[PDB]
């Protein structure tokens, strides 16, 4: 019972984790994301159009994580300490403004770690079913787009 957008924003972290499990470290860098209502889009740097099989697996794993109802942990830490603890992987391609010394790090254990200060659900179960609507690879930009939506 969080707003729909809070659930969708939380889904981005679950979807990213699935993307990395399926596609590997080559897709670990988020370029951008966007949420509107129950719809979201995750854009990561990648070098090819995933196969229908890979796409189906990303969706399955995302939903499996939701069903597990794992906790979505938030750690507030000095920026340099977070860097020592999590390394470069907690960041996306657009660096957090340099003046930010207090960082909030979102952790879904063994799934995804990301510096993000937005509101999130407390557990992955609160997100609800996730459906991948469209996947688009922009060869010229080296970016992979994953469009999805929440069933509630």
Token pair for 137: 């690879």
Dist. CA 83–CA 118, nearest whole Å: 19
Quick one: 116 or 143, whose CB is closer to Zn ion? 116
Token pair for 44: 């990561």
122 binds Zn ion (CB under 5 A): no
Quick one: 42 or 116, whose CB is closer to Zn ion? 116
127 binds Zn ion (CB under 5 A): no
User: Is 116 assigned to a binding site?
Assistant: yes
118 binds Zn ion (CB under 5 A): yes
Residue 148 to residues 8, 26, 28, 84, 140, Cα–Cα distance (Å): 9, 21, 18, 33, 23
Binding residues for Zn(2+): 9, 13, 116, 120
* Contacting positions for Zn ion (CB under 5 A): 116, 118
């Amino acid at each position: 019972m969080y707003s729909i957008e809070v659930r969708t924003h939380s889904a981005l972290h679950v979807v990213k984790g699935a993307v990395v499990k399926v596609l590997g470290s080559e897709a670990k860098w988020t370029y951008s994301t966007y949420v509107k209502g129950n719809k979201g889009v995750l854009i990561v740097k990648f070098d090819r159009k995933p196969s229908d099989e890979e796409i189906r697996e990303i969706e399955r794993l995302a939903n499996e994580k939701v069903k597990e109802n794992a906790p979505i942990k938030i750690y507030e830490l000095p920026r340099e300490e977070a860097e020592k603890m999590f390394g470069e992987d907690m960041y996306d391609l657009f660096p957090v403004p340099e003046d930010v010394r207090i960082l909030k790090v979102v952790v879904i254990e063994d799934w995804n770690v990301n510096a993000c200060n937005k509101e999130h659900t407390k557990t992955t179960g609160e997100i609800g079913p996730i459906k991948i609507r469209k996947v688009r690879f922009r060869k010229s930009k080296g970016l992979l787009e994953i469009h999805f939506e929440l069933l509630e």
